[PDB]
Design a protein around this nucleic acid. Structure first.
Length: 704
RNA sequence: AGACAGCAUGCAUGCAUGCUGUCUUU
RNA sequence: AGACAGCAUGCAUGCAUGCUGUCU
């Protein structure tokens, strides 16, 4: 059952172990810490890692002092402490830091990309109704620390999708308003949403000088160079403000596109290179890693050519039973379970509003048939669906659909569920990004209305019964009549609590923020949810927000001395952790608190189709965990789970997580997140965008 | 002395070729 | 492989100048 991850043990043991250490003349503002380290490595030319407040250069310096200039014009002075000897890294950060810099100095990554081009240049550029599209290979490296304490190189491969089109071009060619595009600057390893666009006619001369003077890359230097010399360009050229507070000229900014927001035709050519199956991927990873070894071993770097291995499989309680007690263990679906299944009917008249979007007027028959058989099925379950209104919307593009959905959805009030049939809408404007299914989902989630959006492509492709159940199972859950429950979960847990918090910014000060909290009993059924907006608190926000969660648990009569598990989609920072102990005492609860980091984790490469439950154990109580099986084409990315604190083993916390997976009530699609935090961040970001104070709650998975 | 052609050197345009560098893909 | 810059060349047409030969 062997499963391998793209992680490779790494250590650094050079012959010359002599570094030159540098210290700040006064404490450095923490988020300025990385910019400074980067800067040391440019001047020095010597790889550098940061050791608490000090800087370590892998060579011999003489320079008594060393002055570095940040983009502000701000100057940090480093003094030479003197040479120190190197024995080990204290943590992975040091190790990563130095490791990448070596990659830079040696230029391996650069070579591989070049090489990769010489050979696939042609297979990597593709054609489309109107546009051309480059798929550019991205090699990426982090350093992690395993359970036994070895460091591990995390190595991956991806294909960033891009047009052949400068951002300037698109802003003269159009006069367009795209404050919602992601972007990469040529020769800069950065990618981030376009914040603010102004023109270059509004800035002096000394300006583009300093701008040049402080550029930390060749291409940005050469960019501002242009505007510094050629005044012809100035009046024409545009200037773009970036996500994490950068400005670049518009000629070095090219868009970064996502698979999804590809117009249909394109998606298809793309698909093979972008979605490449495990084997190939792993082989390239292997292939790069070799170059890396070959090019770095001579400077003292020791890298196993061998992949770490899945430590094993966790069993978790996947047994599930209906209102009669009929039960079966969840692996994939049991389409059979769902047929003979008999739900916990809480509300037995349901009022649907129906919407259908479509090109022409009399072709509703597939939809009408599908609806007929749902209504039926649901009746044979104790539920009668009753239809309050239908709306047939004719439309010819996504936009026309959109414009027309807006008032229709607007008038909708007092209903258990809305069902929406969406016709297929072929392309759009490629800048005018927009998934139509989502839009609907979004507009209805804002209304707290549980909804079912059925793609008319799905009814043309999939079998009526297959579809029937997937829908039938969500709708049942959606609307309070839970179709089956978990028998139990590992541990003697009393509530599982999922927290989620989004915060709008202004001058580094947190202004609006929206918290979504979801509470579940021991057997794992929703007890109530909590949708709360907060006005501005600063420092004090984090405390209030948690505080509420506790004052809440208590109003639900969680008898003190009860046990409370807290999953979170984000990444808990220090103040939260302590904030949690505080309230853990005051309310007298024993708490397990987890951090779930879903994005960009190492991958399992394995022969087994059913990798749910696999894992690899990292240092400090954190685990890489498969939560779903490899359904092919799309990427299986495991979740990283991390016991911040608690009396229970992480393996036990992980199985709970796997149990709760099943409570998203989606036997067929493979929901990656567990039911406490699933879609939590979608809702949180979504209500933020909102335009007035919110404080709602309820007892029904309206969001599924 | 004029008018025309072969060759040489120096220059003018046109078109084409070999190598090297950059960036495209720090 | 393409875009641009460095360098080295080739063919072609003419002009400059120079010796060459024809010419009414």
């Amino acid at each position: 059952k062997e499963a391998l991850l793209n992680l490779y043990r790494i250590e650094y043991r050079p012959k010359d172990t002599t570094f030159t250490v540098f210290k700040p003349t006064h404490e450095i503002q923490k988020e300025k810490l990385n910019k400074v380290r980067w800067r040391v490595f440019l001047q020095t030319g010597l790889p550098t890692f940061r050791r608490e407040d000090e800087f370590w250069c892998a060579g011999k310096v003489e320079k008594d002092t060393l002055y570095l200039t940040l983009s502000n014009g701000e100057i940090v002075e480093l003094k030479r402490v003197g040479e120190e000897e190197f024995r080990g890294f204290q943590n992975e950060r040091e190790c990563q830091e130095l490791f990448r810099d070596f990659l830079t100095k040696t230029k391996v990554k650069d070579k591989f990309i070049s090489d990769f081009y010489k050979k696939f240049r042609d297979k990597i550029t593709v054609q489309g109704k109107n546009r051309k599209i480059a798929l550019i290979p991205e090699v990426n490296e982090k350093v992690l620390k395993s359970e036994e304490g070895y460091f591990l190189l995390h190595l991956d491969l991806k294909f960033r999708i891009q047009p052949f089109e400068t951002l300037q071009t698109l802003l003269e060619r159009n006069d367009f308003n795209p404050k919602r595009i992601r972007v990469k600057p040529i020769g800069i390893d950065f990618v981030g949403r376009v914040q603010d666009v102004f023109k270059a006619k509004e800035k002096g001369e000394e300006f583009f000088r300093l701008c040049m003077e402080r550029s930390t890359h060749k291409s940005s230097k050469k960019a501002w160079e242009e505007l510094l010399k050629n005044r012809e360009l100035r009046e024409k050229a545009f200037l773009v403000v970036l996500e994490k507070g950068y400005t670049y000229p518009a000629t070095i900014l090219k868009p970064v596109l996502t698979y999804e927001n590809l117009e249909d035709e394109e998606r298809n050519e793309v698909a093979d290179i972008v979605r490449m199956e495990p084997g190939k991927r792993l082989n390239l990873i292997r292939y790069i890693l070799r170059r890396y070894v070959k090019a770095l071993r001579d400077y003292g770097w020791y890298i196993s050519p061998e992949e770490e291995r899945a430590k094993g499989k966790l069993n978790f309680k996947d047994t599930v039973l209906d209102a009669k007690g009929k039960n079966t263990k969840v692996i994939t679906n049991l389409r059979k379970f769902l047929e003979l299944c008999r739900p916990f009917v809480k509300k037995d008249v349901l009022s649907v509003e129906i919407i259908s979007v479509s090109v022409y007027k009399k072709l509703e028959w597939r939809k009408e048939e599908f609806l007929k058989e749902l209504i039926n099925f649901l009746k044979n379950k104790g539920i009668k669906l009753k239809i309050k209104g239908k709306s047939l919307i004719l439309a010819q593009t996504r936009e026309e659909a959109k414009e027309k959905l807006i008032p229709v959805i607007n008038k909708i009030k007092d209903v258990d569920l809305v069902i929406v049939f969406l016709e297929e809408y072929p392309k759009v404007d490629p800048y005018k990004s927009f998934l139509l299914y989502d839009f609907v989902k979004r507009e209805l989630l804002k209304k707290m209305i549980p909804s079912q959006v059925i793609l008319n492509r799905t009814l043309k492709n999939e079998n009526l019964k297959f579809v029937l159940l997937n829908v039938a199972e969500q709708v049942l859950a959606k609307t309070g009549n839970i179709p089956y429950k978990l028998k139990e979960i590992e541990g003697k847990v009393d509530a599982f609590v999922g927290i989620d918090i989004s915060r709008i910014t202004r001058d580094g000060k947190t202004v609006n923020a929206v918290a979504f909290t979801k509470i579940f009993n021991s057997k794992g059924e929703l007890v109530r949810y909590y949708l709360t907006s907060y006005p501005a608190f600063g420092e004090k926000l984090t405390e209030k927000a948690i505080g509420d969660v506790f004052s809440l648990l208590e109003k639900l009569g969680f008898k003190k001395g009860s046990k409370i598990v807290v999953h979170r989609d984000g990444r808990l920072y220090r103040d939260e952790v302590a904030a949690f102990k505080k309230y853990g005492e005051l309310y007298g609860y024993s708490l397990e608190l987890l951090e779930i980091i879903k994005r960009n984790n190492p991958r399992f490469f394995s022969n087994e189709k059913f990798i749910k439950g696999y894992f690899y154990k990292l240092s400090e109580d954190s685990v890489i965990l498969a939560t779903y099986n490899q359904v092919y084409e799309g990427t299986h990315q495991p979740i990283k789970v991390r016991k911040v604190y608690g009396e229970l083993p992480v393996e036990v916390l992980c199985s709970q997580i796997l149990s709760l997976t099943l409570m998203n009530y989606s036997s067929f699609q493979p929901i990656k997140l567990p039911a406490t935090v699933h879609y939590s961040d979608k809702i949180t970001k979504l209500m933020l965008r909102g335009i007035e104070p919110i404080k709602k709650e309820g007892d029904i998975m309206y969001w599924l």
